[PDB]
Symmetry: C5
Subunit: 319 residues, 5 copies
């Protein structure tokens, strides 16, 4: 199963390492052809004493430390951001059953509550993602996709605040469910409070995405691991050359014109640096798909599925 | 205890590494017999300078880094997927006691609720597993096993959605428990809300299996660790040869016809790569057993065990 | 404090490594005496070229990787199993106060509830432990210790299920607390539901021990780390010999008749493999003590301590 | 994306390593010029035998261990402190809806509750941060920013306690919400208890910041990793010198006047020590911004947004 | 900031490593003076062949593995024990408001409840700490500090149990709050159950300290890492000697009379073993301070702060 995953291209390592590899191939053979064709005899001698100096400081081992601890923090943080995505499904199961009414008003009342829950999720995704920000560059594009009505857009800007306004529909939700309770649509206080708790569960997950994006991996700690990988390949552009074996240096007794086991270390060390680079901004998760799923499912379960059940009949294991 | 676990075959390392080992044995002795029998005297000399080149780039240590951090992420993620399995037992203890009625209707009413809870678990297991998907290739096979009645199958397809419909029975559950409350079968709002919370507990565990399967370990990070293991064994097909000791190379002063301590490194490095490969798709967990347990226990505890208790008598420690 | 913990014997490393060490001492000096006394002069020469071959493949470093990542997964999983032990103390504090009645019936009613909670814990401990399984080999031994009355034993076998029946008393609990509520012993629905939630808290902890035991560390991943430790000591039975220093091999210029710094590596590498071996089955935790504590405390707090409090008098800090 | 993050200055590694680098450059070339210009011929010989001694104890590898495990504990603890920040948004959604009243009193009553919640967060941030402590050096500065009224300041000092008084407004909150319930402003006990639970959720997050600051990474464990980095660079001020290549030492056959691959190890090892140093006091998080956001949003959502909703009209997906 | 933390003494590494260092200095120069002054010429020769044998088995790298994984488990477990400390503040906010009454009885009733909560925390701290056990050697010392009245001391010993009796006041709490509810002091069942849940939250944190102390890091795993550190310094007492450079051994061409870079490895390896040793018994946390804080704050907030609030006046941001 791992033996066949090398041959895939889309989303693989070769599409991602296609540009940095051809730079490394170009800077390798250019230095080699200067040594092989251009430089004079004593100038070949000055290069060989420099390549032996560069070949010692390419210790493979302390580069493998800093890539291991860095990437393991990136992937761990990447898993926490997916667990912090607001799924509307817990509010959806309570709005669909405890907000009573099957007339025009109570149907409109349920559809407004689930449209506030998704709006409290879109307005944080368009600040932490670049794909959702390209889908909704302004607030008018949110109105065009029907997440926000033209009456809610005007109220959204009279509320004047210099901060991120993702918390606006999560206060509109709880004020509408109390207004729904005081008209008889929600029966009890216990059922009202159960709806208000799953709001604050989703309020807190939108408050984690608001925190993981703004507080990233430290920029100084990114820059350490990129120097040490580029420093390793810096010495390998000089140290891993094939010299002339006539001068009997230790470890250069065969010319091969191409370092096979050095270019495989490029797809190891630089490829394990591109792991952390692809995951440090994981929103450029199909989040345009994610919004289309959550909006379509939520409005479905509270409008087409409110108190209309299949017929209760006996199953196959009846006694 | 660890001393005797080497000799087991079923589920061991030797059943899993039987094919990749005989390829490695075949590619080893074939290269050796070309050096020993076919190649001429100067052609033996060109091989020996290539084997000394290959023997240096087989550094054992930076391969052991990338297998350690990779497999430790695989096993950690493997443990989270087992903790995310929906057990019906928490809903089962509340449906069996608070959904009152011992006539034909209330018995049918309890058995429908626990059959929706298992159906909200099967429809996510047949998307994350290949064994359950072979057990239920279509939705008609779910009806044949009695998880879904022929009235619920027709309602399940009138609900039109281009997404995974595992959320359908978790909305049918909460709408039936509210209908059960408004006929007098559930007594209070506090007992109704307690049933609706354990639904959303199981709704969230089905929503983790929906996430761990679709969002896997990154494909680029799989492909790094498989190059570096196969690159290590690539140099060992050339570097670990037994040369002629007459030419006095350092570390080749004895012919043995079989590298014992290299083939043990195959069962170390390739065997510690097969650990992550067996765990990255752990559903191909006896999940056909798991569904048969959860369905049989849930229907048992709400139908044979509703309010029929053993006789209250004094225990052994009575004063 | 660490300086004195070497000298302890009970539960130490020397009681655990007493058998594997004397095998390693025996296989060492036997190979040495063949080289020193039995083999001829050319046969001494063939051994010395084999010991130089074995001494290179005993790289200490890539063995220390696979023991570090393996044992750190074992100890982490070992800590999760202790946090998953059902303590009855949360149910005990609610049964002792909200299940009213001080006559013969309500006293019997409280003692039955806490005896179901411990029985829902014993029946999972006798499947995950070998010590509790030796304490209770059958179900009749559970009746002899008074956990199960002879009326509950007959009901326990009329309930026919091919699976583990630890879930039986956790359904008996919730059906008895509803019967207690409908006789006036529990006052309200809010107090009933609070008792039924701490049942499902303990139901879920018994459902983790049901999962950590059946789903272990993978058998292929155990077998990797035991080959690599035994392969390391395999080369050290040949490579770490003291040769004749007259032939001037590099690193053999002194005979000592006993490798002190190799036998210390046995108590390092094999001793750090016995860490994971002692922890991978941690039930062979004083779980016979644990059951005796939980049963005695639970029946105490609901029978001797129900609504009988010390006298309310003023403390030392009164104003 | 990682290729361009090297060139940034603000918040990068070069602003942080500007002072320690020029000390290291100064102590390098000063020792070199003493060897090159000042010392006599035999005194050059005594230095060269000292530089060969220093060059062996600069093992790069066991320094990379202790920096990896240390920094990974620092960054993990740094992520826990951001998850422990009290956001007022969960209390804000319940105070804005369940504390009824639109007259002068109930508007004043809501604004007092959210001003106690922020005050229970500021008084712990001015003990764990130095930026908030510079913003509020005394308690009078808290009154000047309007967090505390001049009547609450006098009560705050009559309460005499030798400890940190951050727990004072979290007891004032719960006593005011009970007084609000007993005047009819909060309707039920279920809605009162829901407000009192989100207080204790925020009480516990303020109790984590009270614990992460006082209980830090151990001072002995900080001092280990700083010796080992400074010891590594101590040997490199002697060992990494360019000697005279006329005396044919192994690894000194070329003069370069500047160690390029040693100064890159300064920006690797010392730069990966400055990662943990910047994160071990992460409050010197824009916490002056954080207080200005939370105070302005909380008073907004309970005063301008209490029960004043946009007009319920049909969305774009109406049928 | 890290540059100045070397110079501190109190709580540093030098106070902790003052005894083990002077032993290591004494055993070093004693062996050196035997080689330099006492032993004869051939006896100097037998030492030099032993020091070359000892210098190879002091591989720095596989000692750094076992200290890294061990200490990272110690510090992780050390952080969990601080998060498991029972703070009384969540019970304190509910007892201070929902236990009504301002006369002599209800004031006495509140002060008894918070004195049971601290007593359920002290009786577990005097079993897991040695400082609290020295503060309270018996149960009579608990009465002298006013935690337990002389009426509660007599009831505490009539309850006969061979186990740790820390669970006694956590059952007295819940029985007193039910007695307070049935006299009209607590209003509703919802407010009673909210007090009984924060008891079981604190009951579970006292049940973690009861578990982290009794179930420690395994004794076999402590003893591994202490052999391997002491074995490393064992070879360094022989291998790191300065020999006579007249005999031209590789790596001994300069006498220095003091190994500077070996004694720095003592403050690295032994100092990183003292990290885990100081943290494995972290109670010998200012827990005498902790009890004095929690008792004084809890009795304060329920007696001086019950329903006596500051005057509601308008803040600075009024409109």
């Amino acid at each position: 199963t791992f033996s066949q995953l090398l041959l895939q291209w889309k989303g693989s390592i070769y599409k991602l390492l296609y540009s940095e590899f051809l730079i490394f191939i170009s800077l390798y053979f250019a230095i080699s052809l200067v040594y092989r064709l251009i430089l004079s005899e004593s100038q070949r001698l000055m290069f060989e004493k420099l390549a032996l100096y560069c070949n010692s400081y390419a210790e493979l081992i302390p580069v493998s430390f800093v890539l291991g601890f860095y990437v393991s923090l990136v992937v761990s943080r990447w898993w926490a951001q997916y667990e912090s995505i607001p799924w509307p499904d817990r509010i959806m199961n309570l709005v669909s059953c405890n907000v009573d009414g099957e007339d025009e008003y109570g149907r409109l009342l349920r559809r407004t509550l689930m449209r506030y829950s998704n709006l409290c999720s879109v307005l944080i995704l368009r600040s932490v993602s670049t794909a959702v920000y390209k889908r909704f560059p302004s607030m008018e594009h949110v109105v065009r996709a029907g997440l926000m009505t033209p009456e809610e857009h005007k109220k959204f800007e009279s509320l004047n605040s210099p901060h991120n306004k993702f918390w606006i529909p999560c206060v509109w939700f709880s004020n509408l469910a109390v207004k729904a309770r005081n008209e008889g649509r929600i029966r009890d206080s216990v059922l009202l409070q159960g709806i208000l708790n799953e709001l604050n569960t989703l309020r807190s997950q939108c408050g984690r995405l608001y925190g993981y994006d703004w507080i990233s991996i430290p920029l100084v700690y990114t820059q350490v691991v990129t120097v040490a990988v580029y420093s390793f390949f810096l010495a390998c552009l000089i140290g891993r050359q094939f010299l002339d074996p006539e001068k009997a240096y230790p470890g250069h007794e065969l010319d091969l014109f191409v370092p096979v086991f050095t270019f495989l270390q490029f797809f190891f060390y630089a490829g394990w640096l591109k792991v952390a680079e692809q995951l440090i901004n994981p929103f450029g998760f199909e989040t345009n798909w994610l919004i289309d799923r959550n909006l379509q499912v939520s409005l479905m379960a509270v409008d087409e599925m409110h108190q209309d059940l299949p017929i209760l009949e006996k199953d196959l294991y009846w006694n």
